[PDB]
Amino acid sequence: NIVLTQSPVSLAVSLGQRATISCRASESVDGYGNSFLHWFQQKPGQPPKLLIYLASNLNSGVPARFSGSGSRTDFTLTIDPVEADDAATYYCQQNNVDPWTFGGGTKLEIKRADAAPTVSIFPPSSEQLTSGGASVVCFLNNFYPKDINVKWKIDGSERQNGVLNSWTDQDSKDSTYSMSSTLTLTKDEYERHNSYTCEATHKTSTSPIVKSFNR
Amino acid sequence: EVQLQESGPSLVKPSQTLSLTCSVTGDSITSGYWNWIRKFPGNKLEYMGYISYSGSTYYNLSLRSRISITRDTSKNQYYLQLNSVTTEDTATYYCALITTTTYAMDYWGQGTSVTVSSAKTTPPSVYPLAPNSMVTLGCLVKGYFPEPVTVTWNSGSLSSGVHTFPAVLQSDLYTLSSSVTVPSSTWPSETVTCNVAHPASSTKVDKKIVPR
């Protein structure tokens, strides 16, 4: 069946610089002198937004920092100059050959200055303890670069089991990333120990970044 | 000026039929091509099909045997039915219009999550997170199914300074958390409340964050 191949799989571009994304079709998507190849931007929690239609036309409401070109089987989308709001995944789509398809996406990351995470740690609520569970939470907010690792310790020893983590995608305004880490124990285990610590490794420090509280 | 909005169940059992409606406002469904598209948890987008302004349809061959798209022009709505679903049909479903102005999918609904699972709908527990000139507080929302849960703070009036994190599934139950950061001169002197909605269980929960 027809396929659309996007490349690269992702790219990181500084503000003001140019991003070039490729979409190649395995066979021609042209008909009637049109290339039925369109480009979309999509961010988490939102539907795809049409940027470029019929290979090279800007949709109303899209800025001329976006342009597309190509015909038949080879197409490009260019964003120049890139802005912070452009952090998203971009897809091509063709609607003239059965079956209609989308490319696999190319994620654009925006570069910015390094930013250390703001770390905050939270003990189990009394509400949760009434259900016999105990979650300790650390938020690690507004950092850059995106790479971060969290380790938990209990009374100074690493604890691996019971940890669930979640990461935001890149912020469209400040180009940072955030992360939540939750350590879940039973209330009984929670009450066997005193000190609970989340330790983050991030490029902004050569030593662990540590938050703690004491039961 | 056209607007589209998807609605229908957020949870469907394996082997049954998934049904969604798209309600269209500010234009009539007797011009244009009225489509369904879905986005898998892995993020891949798949085209499902259309019903056109004439009543004619086009379906993706990967689905042609199980799908039907129909319409009711007296309600300005059109509908998707997808038979014999499996867990592989869990996705965010979108309706979108193609006009012949662009020949592209040019107006989209916000999308609606449908999970296909034998796991049971379970309402959330909402736990307050309480602990400088800035203070971060939060809510931990645990033990619910299916997605989505939404979170606001002070009914949307604290909006900047919020991070709500993607939910994580463990053993057929989701956990999600949300943080909000405010000046220490505003809390605890003024109230801060996270408002958690879980429409699948018909639940809203407000939790005010009180100091420990």
Partner: peptide
Amino acid sequence: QLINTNGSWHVN
């Protein structure tokens, strides 16, 4: 405008 049939656009 073009009309679509079975995924492809045509004049008639």
